[PDB]
Ligand binder design. Sequence first.
Ligand SMILES: [Mg+2]
Ligand SMILES: [Mg+2]
Lengths: 193, 193
Amino acid sequence: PSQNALYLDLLKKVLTNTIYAHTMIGLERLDNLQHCVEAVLADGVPGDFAETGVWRGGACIFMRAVLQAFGDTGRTVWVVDSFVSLETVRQNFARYGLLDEQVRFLPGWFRDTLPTAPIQELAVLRLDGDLYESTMDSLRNLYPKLSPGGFVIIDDYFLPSCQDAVKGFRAELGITEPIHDIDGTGAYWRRSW
Amino acid sequence: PSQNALYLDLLKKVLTNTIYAHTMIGLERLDNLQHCVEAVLADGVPGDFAETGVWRGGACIFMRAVLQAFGDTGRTVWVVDSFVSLETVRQNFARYGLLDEQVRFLPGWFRDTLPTAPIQELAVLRLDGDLYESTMDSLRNLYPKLSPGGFVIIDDYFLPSCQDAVKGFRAELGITEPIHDIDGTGAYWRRSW
Ligand SMILES: [Mg+2]
Ligand SMILES: [Mg+2]
């Protein structure tokens, strides 16, 4: 059931700066990110949230905001990137009053930070898969933490080179859950039960 | 009881542009405007809302937003000024998706538009009382429509010349409901029962 719909609808107008930028990903993809997050809450899919490649942080701020909207104080949002520096993203969470303990930051190269990542389980995994290595590093390390019922979201999936990186990973692991389109740009799938 | 608090809290961060301008009046005065509007809804004080001197319209957008937040479809918000033109304010309501039938516009000089004003009753009357004539025109014409339990809000009350205009009006009508401070700038009073 849709708690604080108005809040989240306004926040998307604001994050996308449609109101006068904090995320390039646009409305349709924030919409997708809302439904996936609301599904894991409603269905009881355990785990934290995590985005690799956050840029200014809008998507991570938004995921945090949905947790705010449904009164979930247990799940953590993981903001993972090299760093548009870290402190700028931090204070981007602040301006929404969401810079708190439900937001943790993993600064550094993915090669270095992800294998030893202090994440136990995920209900949502998100990546702006522009590059081959970034995508594999993210999927290979973090996907195994993705709980059943959890979602993987790939923001630039339909870029052919991103496609191929992704098909390659799904072949490696024998992952066969079917991919669904979002907007001709991004795509996602829900891990099986 | 506080419906959609998160929505309204975010909207104030946005209207005041504390998030990256739509109202100069600031947080404390949007806060005051929230409590007064929530009181008339909770207490059943009938009537529309009306602001004279709106500038970009932020306060009027906000009043409309509180109606959005409490699911009140009956009350109208009156946006009253000469016109930073009218159409700019209109599309300022649009960017929040609140440009609808619960918002009506009274363009023109107060001398011309207010005596023949198509307003029946008010629960909230608001003015940025910078000038003597604007203040009197607003109070004299519209205050008598203010229901019992209704609020009058004067955004620049503590400016000495605004003070005196206002004391003058309250003397004229034998209005004795005591004035309360907001922030050292604005002030308001609640009409008696
Ligand atoms: Mg992208
Ligand atoms: Mg003023």
